[PDB]
A = this chain, B = another copy of it.
Amino acid sequence: AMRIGHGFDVHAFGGEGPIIIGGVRIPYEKGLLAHSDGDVALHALTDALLGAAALGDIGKLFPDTDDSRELLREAWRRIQAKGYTLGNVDVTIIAQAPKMLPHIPQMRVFIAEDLGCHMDEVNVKATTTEKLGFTGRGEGIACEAVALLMK
């Protein structure tokens, strides 16, 4: 038995940079507004994983009301507690700028660390909306993730 999940997160630019994405500080004119560290890749990743496990989402488990890497780790703990193991993950950063490609190899390493898995089971990509939409206008950054879990 195997399970699929999907996650999506967005944070708005504000304040001064750098931004943290996939656990990597990327220098930029602007920072990202958030309650946590605003790591849109790790949030989206975490929700895909919880979603595959039918454990809900970060919103339910970790209320903004009541850091991302730790949220990921705590989510994974619970998910492994349920008998699941990693199949793979794939992540899609949607952003006009800054350039992500230089920082992506390091993000894989970090995610692999956090999920206790091999780097070849983690992929991360960047894609632009060609100046369209709120990401295109540089109002914020969005990220999507998918995950496959095996029981």
Contact = CB atoms under 8 A, between A and B. Distances in A.
Interface stretch (A15-23, A68-76, A115-123): A115-123
A104 B139 CA distance: 29
A106 interface: no
A115 B125 CA distance: 21
Given A87-B1, A125-B56, A132-B12, A6 B92 contact: yes
B94 A51 contact: no
Nearest to A64: B128
A60 B129 CA distance: 16
Q: Bin chain A's interface residue count.
A: 35 or more
A42 interface: no
Interface in A29-87: 33, 47-48, 50-57, 59-60, 87
A133 interface: yes
Contacts of A9: 127
Nearest to A129: B10
A10 B130 contact: yes
Contact of A123 (B5, B132, B134): B5
A146 B136 CA distance: 23
A120 B53 CA distance: 8
Contacts of A109: none
Contact of A10 (B53, B60, B132): B132
The 3 A-B pairs of least Cβ separation, nearest first, read A51-B90, A57-B125, A132-B134
